[PDB]
Paper text:
The At2g21370 gene product from Arabidopsis thaliana, xylulose kinase-1 (AtXK-1), whose mature form contains 436 amino acids, is located in the chloroplast (ChloroP 1.1 Server). SePSK and AtXK-1 display a sequence identity of 44.9%, and belong to the ribulokinase-like carbohydrate kinases, a sub-family of FGGY family carbohydrate kinases. Domain I exhibits a ribonuclease H-like folding pattern, and is responsible for the substrate binding, while domain II possesses an actin-like ATPase domain that binds cofactor ATP.
Our results suggested that three conserved residues (D8, T11 and D221 of SePSK) play an important role in SePSK function. To identify the function of these three residues of SePSK, we constructed D8A, T11A and D221A mutants. The O4 and O5 of RBL1 are coordinated with the side chain carboxyl group of Asp221. Three conserved residues in SePSK were identified to be essential for this function.
Residue numbers in the entry: 2 to 421
Write the structure that this text describes.
Amino acid sequence: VVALGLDFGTSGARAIACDFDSDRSVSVSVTFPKTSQNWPQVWREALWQLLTQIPADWRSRIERIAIDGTSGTVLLCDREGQPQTEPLLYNQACPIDLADLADWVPADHAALSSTSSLAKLWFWQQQFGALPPDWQILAQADWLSLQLHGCSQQSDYHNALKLGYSPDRERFSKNLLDSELGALLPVVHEPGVAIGPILPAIAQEFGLSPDCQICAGTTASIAAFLASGAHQPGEAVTSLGSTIVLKLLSQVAVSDRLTGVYSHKLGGYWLTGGASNCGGATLRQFFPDTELESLSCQIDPTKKSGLDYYPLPSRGERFPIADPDRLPQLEPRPENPVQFLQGLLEGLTQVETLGYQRLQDLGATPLKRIWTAGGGAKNAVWQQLRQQAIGVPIAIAPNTEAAFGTARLAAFGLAAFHSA
């Protein structure tokens, strides 16, 4: 099978045409401006550019296409999919009372944030006063795929989660559907399934096969996990980027609203996770990547440093333990930079450890393996500390690109996430 994965990030977009029969692949990229007063147009043009940069002999063999977008970015469009107002982005919060959403979701739902799609929809509702039933609200991936198949009000239960969708019971609440917001909600499918055939004009214009299928998309955070290929409960992906992001595959959904922990549905399994403010950003505050490696090469992990740090970049922690007043603990400081770096890495290691432990304490499936992603993944000393502190096999993930995971999503769907 030859599938195309489309990843739409925060600062740009990457496309990966992957060909799983050989295996061979080709990747292309576009970078967004940092400012614009017409983001949908930018996204659309980015889509066409991505399609254009892909070689013809590749486009003529693409069978299935999938699109992942940023979780939280939404658009308000009419019945034809034309943006009526300018999008509300993933980072933008809304000045509304969450108590207004209490009757539409359980009292622990992930949609109960000031950044969630439901909150943004309520905000738009109290700007416009009364949103027409003719209209629709669409996630970025929803809209971008709408550019490909033309079927309106279609979505997956990854992006719909923060819109108020209940993946546990495969539905929206009856109160939400009975409300004045119910008409704008999309039909929710499973990520990977084929929504419909590609538009004939589009296929003609880009030399694509008219029998090509556009599948239901997902989020970038999940597509990144899908790139690893982990499908057994207990398997986890740890992202050692600027901030440490933990993702654990479990047989049971967990949730802790205080720490921002919630679970996505993934086939017959669940994908839980968390995000700490600690990470590689704290490391580059004291060392450039220049000195970082040259100092890490002098660290023997099999002996403790005697240091006990909590490597926060600034005031406030979110996960595993939530306290918005916790100061960074980076004392005492030995003059030997090696042991200081070791202390930092030990701190981060403890962050990851306590994270996974808390995830297990919330009811998630016991940890079995670790697949590491991010810049810190190639750090073998850090890997040693991590394995010493956790006690499970840790290795570098074969792939980390979200577009590739989206390609695997288009080609195979969420089939592997069952036990049959």
